[PDB]
């Protein structure tokens, strides 16, 4: 079980469950990149093929999610929203860059463990990179 790149699960388990769009939304965010980036400019960089890892997976997972149509206690675990973080980590790291993404995760992880009296009322915002 791993994340290399410079982060750990212990970092991503700080960002709240509303920091992330849904699974399918992020699938649209990837279809606007792997389609508009990976083969459009020729760059093979690790975050695109890492997307394809996870994107494929969630495919070979929700394949099971439709294969539970063979049952009727089907409470199928959507705790696989641990992909939403994963899919975010690459997507953001392929727009802002792994530099700014890991830096953001470190500062946010620092701000969460800071008692609220000594910190700004709002966690760090990840600002977009402009035109």
């Amino acid at each position, epitope marked *: 079980p791993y994340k290399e790149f410079g982060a750990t699960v212990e970092l991503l388990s700080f960002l*709240p*469950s509303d920091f*992330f*769009p849904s699974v399918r*939304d992020l699938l*649209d965010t990837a279809a606007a990149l792997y389609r508009d980036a990976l083969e459009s400019p020729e760059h093979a960089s690790p975050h695109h093929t890492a997307l394809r890892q996870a994107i494929l997976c969630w495919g070979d997972l929700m394949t099971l999610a439709t294969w539970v149509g063979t049952n009727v206690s089907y409470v199928n675990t959507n705790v696989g929203l641990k992909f939403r973080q994963l899919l975010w980590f690459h997507i953001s790291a392929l727009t802002f860059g792994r530099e700014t993404v890991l830096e953001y995760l470190v500062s946010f992880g620092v701000w969460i463990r800071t008692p609220p009296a000594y910190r700004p009322p709002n966690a760090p915002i*990840l600002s977009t990179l402009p035109e």
Partner: single-chain antibody
Amino acid sequence: ELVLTQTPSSVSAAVGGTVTINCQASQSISSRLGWYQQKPGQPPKLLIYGASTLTSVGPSRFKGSGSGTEFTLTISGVQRDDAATYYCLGSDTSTDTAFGGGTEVVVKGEQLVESGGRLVPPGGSLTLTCTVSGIDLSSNAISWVRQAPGKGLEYIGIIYGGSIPYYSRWAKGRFTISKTSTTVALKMSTLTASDTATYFCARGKSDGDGYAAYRLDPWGLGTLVTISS
């Protein structure tokens, strides 16, 4: 692509009667509809989210119901206060996210600052600012909606806490949403007269699985953009 077909076109009702507004979406949107009240001159108010669950104001005489396709909003005890134009904002995804056509029911008997809107001649560009106060932009979405004079609400886009924007199909590439330290910027390129409207931003509150596009509260007062040659 999503249509919310909202009927009827207008309800003519009296005091004490029961008023029903039906919204039939085009896809399976799950429980992700929302029900909205717009009084003239005011921003949109959230009545119901999640197709049933009421917000912290809406009176118990309002009731929402339905799921997946059929969604129906009912008013048991309607008074004169409830006479206004109601809209269903359904969300399939953050891209297919669509307002309803609207229904004006007529009966007888949280700091967001939109700015930057101005007059621009056709073909130019304009950048709207939503100055957000009291809201955590790391935990909440900011959606942009517009309304033309005498027209309904038109979902432009949204941006999540992950600083990831989403735009509907008509707005694609012509609009781009940005997020900064204190603000959310809606940039509009190749400006036509189809875009002259009043632009609101609102705070989306995420679903358990991360769908914020259909629960938009609160709203700002808007900013006006008008285009003519």
